Design an enzyme around this catalytic site. Structure first.
Site, PDB file in Angstrom:
ATOM      1  N   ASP A 167     -11.427  92.899  53.606  1.00 45.73           N
ATOM      2  CA  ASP A 167     -12.053  92.211  54.703  1.00 45.73           C
ATOM      3  C   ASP A 167     -10.951  91.660  55.557  1.00 45.73           C
ATOM      4  OD1 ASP A 167     -14.137  91.030  56.278  1.00 45.73           O
ATOM      5  OD2 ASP A 167     -14.185  89.290  54.884  1.00 45.73           O
ATOM      6  N   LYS A 215     -11.257  73.495  49.705  1.00 44.37           N
ATOM      7  CA  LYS A 215     -12.422  74.216  50.053  1.00 44.37           C
ATOM      8  C   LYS A 215     -13.474  74.118  48.932  1.00 44.37           C
ATOM      9  CE  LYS A 215     -13.397  78.734  49.802  1.00 44.37           C
ATOM     10  NZ  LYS A 215     -14.411  79.208  50.789  1.00 44.37           N
ATOM     11  N   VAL A 240     -14.361  72.919  54.423  1.00 46.83           N
ATOM     12  CA  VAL A 240     -12.966  72.652  54.138  1.00 46.83           C
ATOM     13  C   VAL A 240     -12.690  71.218  54.526  1.00 46.83           C
ATOM     14  CG1 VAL A 240     -10.557  73.424  54.615  1.00 46.83           C
ATOM     15  CG2 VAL A 240     -12.370  75.022  54.757  1.00 46.83           C
ATOM     16  N   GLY A 287     -15.659  76.517  60.445  1.00 48.30           N
ATOM     17  CA  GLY A 287     -16.670  77.064  59.535  1.00 48.30           C
ATOM     18  C   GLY A 287     -16.530  78.518  59.176  1.00 48.30           C
ATOM     19  N   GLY A 343     -16.095  78.144  55.619  1.00 54.74           N
ATOM     20  CA  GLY A 343     -17.059  77.208  55.044  1.00 54.74           C
ATOM     21  C   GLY A 343     -16.615  75.756  55.175  1.00 54.74           C
TER      22      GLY A 343
HETATM   23  C1  LIG Z   1      -8.144  79.577  53.103  1.00 54.29           C
HETATM   24  C2  LIG Z   1      -8.121  78.171  53.596  1.00 54.29           C
HETATM   25  C3  LIG Z   1      -6.761  77.488  53.587  1.00 54.29           C
HETATM   26  C4  LIG Z   1      -6.526  76.657  54.794  1.00 54.29           C
HETATM   27  N1  LIG Z   1      -5.365  76.028  55.127  1.00 54.29           N
HETATM   28  N2  LIG Z   1      -5.494  75.343  56.292  1.00 54.29           N
HETATM   29  C5  LIG Z   1      -6.757  75.528  56.720  1.00 54.29           C
HETATM   30  C6  LIG Z   1      -7.265  74.929  57.958  1.00 54.29           C
HETATM   31  O1  LIG Z   1      -8.444  74.886  58.278  1.00 54.29           O
HETATM   32  N3  LIG Z   1      -6.288  74.414  58.775  1.00 54.29           N
HETATM   33  C7  LIG Z   1      -6.578  73.670  59.911  1.00 54.29           C
HETATM   34  C8  LIG Z   1      -7.800  73.402  60.586  1.00 54.29           C
HETATM   35  N4  LIG Z   1      -7.661  72.619  61.654  1.00 54.29           N
HETATM   36  N5  LIG Z   1      -6.332  72.409  61.663  1.00 54.29           N
HETATM   37  C9  LIG Z   1      -5.702  71.561  62.662  1.00 54.29           C
HETATM   38  C10 LIG Z   1      -5.538  70.184  62.066  1.00 54.29           C
HETATM   39  C11 LIG Z   1      -6.627  69.504  61.552  1.00 54.29           C
HETATM   40  C12 LIG Z   1      -6.483  68.233  61.004  1.00 54.29           C
HETATM   41  C13 LIG Z   1      -5.232  67.639  60.972  1.00 54.29           C
HETATM   42  C14 LIG Z   1      -4.146  68.315  61.495  1.00 54.29           C
HETATM   43  C15 LIG Z   1      -4.291  69.586  62.029  1.00 54.29           C
HETATM   44  C16 LIG Z   1      -6.445  71.496  63.985  1.00 54.29           C
HETATM   45  C17 LIG Z   1      -5.782  70.488  64.927  1.00 54.29           C
HETATM   46  C18 LIG Z   1      -6.635  70.293  66.194  1.00 54.29           C
HETATM   47  C19 LIG Z   1      -6.570  71.473  67.100  1.00 54.29           C
HETATM   48  C20 LIG Z   1      -7.133  72.705  66.393  1.00 54.29           C
HETATM   49  S1  LIG Z   1      -6.379  73.094  64.795  1.00 54.29           S
HETATM   50  O2  LIG Z   1      -4.985  73.438  65.030  1.00 54.29           O
HETATM   51  O3  LIG Z   1      -7.287  74.003  64.119  1.00 54.29           O
HETATM   52  C21 LIG Z   1      -5.644  73.007  60.645  1.00 54.29           C
HETATM   53  C22 LIG Z   1      -7.412  76.371  55.794  1.00 54.29           C
HETATM   54  C23 LIG Z   1      -8.790  76.876  55.799  1.00 54.29           C
HETATM   55  C24 LIG Z   1      -9.089  77.877  54.726  1.00 54.29           C
HETATM   56  C25 LIG Z   1      -9.325  77.340  53.356  1.00 54.29           C
HETATM   57  F1  LIG Z   1      -9.069  76.011  53.011  1.00 54.29           F
HETATM   58  F2  LIG Z   1     -10.332  77.844  52.556  1.00 54.29           F
END
Ligand SMILES: C[C@@]12Cc3[nH]nc(C(=O)Nc4cnn([C@H](c5ccccc5)[C@H]5CCCCS5(=O)=O)c4)c3C[C@@H]1C2(F)F
Length: 249
Positions: free
Chosen positions: A127, A36, A22, A17, A20
């Site tokens: 930021d 997002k 995603v 979060g 936000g």
């Molecule tokens: C500015 C952006 C662009 C963006 N690109 N990726 C993300 C993002 O949230 N990536 C993410 C979140 N969780 N994961 C993994 C994941 C999730 C699901 C499948 C595979 C791996 C998780 C796997 C479990 C352990 C923890 S983790 O490593 O965080 C990747 C973002 C956020 C942000 C935006 F989109 F605005």
């Protein structure tokens, strides 16, 4: 710039979060993206599209890429590069005790390289912080939140928290603090301090303490970014060479 919604498949919510709402998604398949969702009328379509185009132009492997924007139907969204290992702040915190100092310094080099690219394009982040960085393939770190941004005093230089006087040099102050967050393995800076105490302590010459894993040399680079006046702070371009040089020395 503009992605037809029929080309996207939304899967599951991802993240804690800090960016936000995603979803994991696929784009004209089977390319993984992060999608997002954003609010309907914060910008106007023209400004918004023109700023998505400017963002898409800022293309560097240390910056999380914007692939495009879906606005035909509501809710409207941003389509981003998927980052395999989530937010750097959580990555660091959950894995405390498992990083070599060299690995932590390489993370600061990744950010510095993205930032030196923004600096060179005359783009001010405003930021910069560990929460705004993401971890990718082979644990590369990438900077995000440098566009489409429509108060964190702890990351603010004195001239930002006094008069909103932003520059690439105020980004350098913030990058000092990000370096501290990295080397402390995701600790919260000035954790029990209120905003006005941070402000008063910084004014008096107080600076974040040296993390255990930061060498003397690294901490000295930190304290250069936290020089009271922007003119005394090194530019990202010079910081990039310097950190790589210390890595090598
Ligand atoms: C500015 C952006 C662009 C963006 N690109 N990726 C993300 C993002 O949230 N990536 C993410 C979140 N969780 N994961 C993994 C994941 C999730 C699901 C499948 C595979 C791996 C998780 C796997 C479990 C352990 C923890 S983790 O490593 O965080 C990747 C973002 C956020 C942000 C935006 F989109 F605005």
């Amino acid at each position: 710039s503009v992605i037809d919604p029929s080309e996207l498949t939304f899967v599951q919510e991802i993240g804690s979060g800090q960016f936000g709402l995603v979803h994991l998604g696929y784009w004209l398949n089977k390319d993984k993206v992060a999608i997002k969702t954003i609010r309907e009328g914060a910008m106007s379509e023209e400004d918004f599209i023109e700023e998505a185009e400017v963002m898409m132009k800022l293309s560097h492997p240390k910056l999380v890429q914007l692939y495009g924007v879906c606005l035909e139907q509501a809710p409207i969204c941003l389509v981003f590069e998927f980052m395999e290992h989530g937010c750097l702040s959580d990555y660091l915190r959950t894995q405390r005790g498992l990083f070599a100092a060299e690995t932590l310094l390489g993370m600061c080099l990744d950010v510095c390289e993205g930032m030196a690219y923004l600096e060179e394009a005359s783009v001010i982040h405003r930021d910069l912080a560990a929460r705004n960085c993401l971890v990718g393939e082979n644990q590369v770190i990438k900077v995000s939140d440098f566009g489409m941004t429509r108060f964190p005093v702890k990351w603010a230089s004195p001239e930002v928290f006094s008069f909103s006087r932003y520059s690439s040099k105020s980004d350098v102050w913030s990058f000092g603090v990000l370096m501290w967050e990295v080397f402390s393995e995701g600790k919260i800076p000035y954790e029990n301090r209120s905003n006005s105490e941070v402000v008063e302590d910084i004014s008096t010459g107080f600076r974040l303490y040296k993390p255990r894993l930061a060498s003397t040399h690294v901490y000295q680079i930190m304290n250069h970014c936290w020089k009271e006046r922007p003119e005394d702070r090194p530019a990202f371009s010079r910081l990039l060479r310097q950190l790589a040089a210390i890595a090598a020395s």
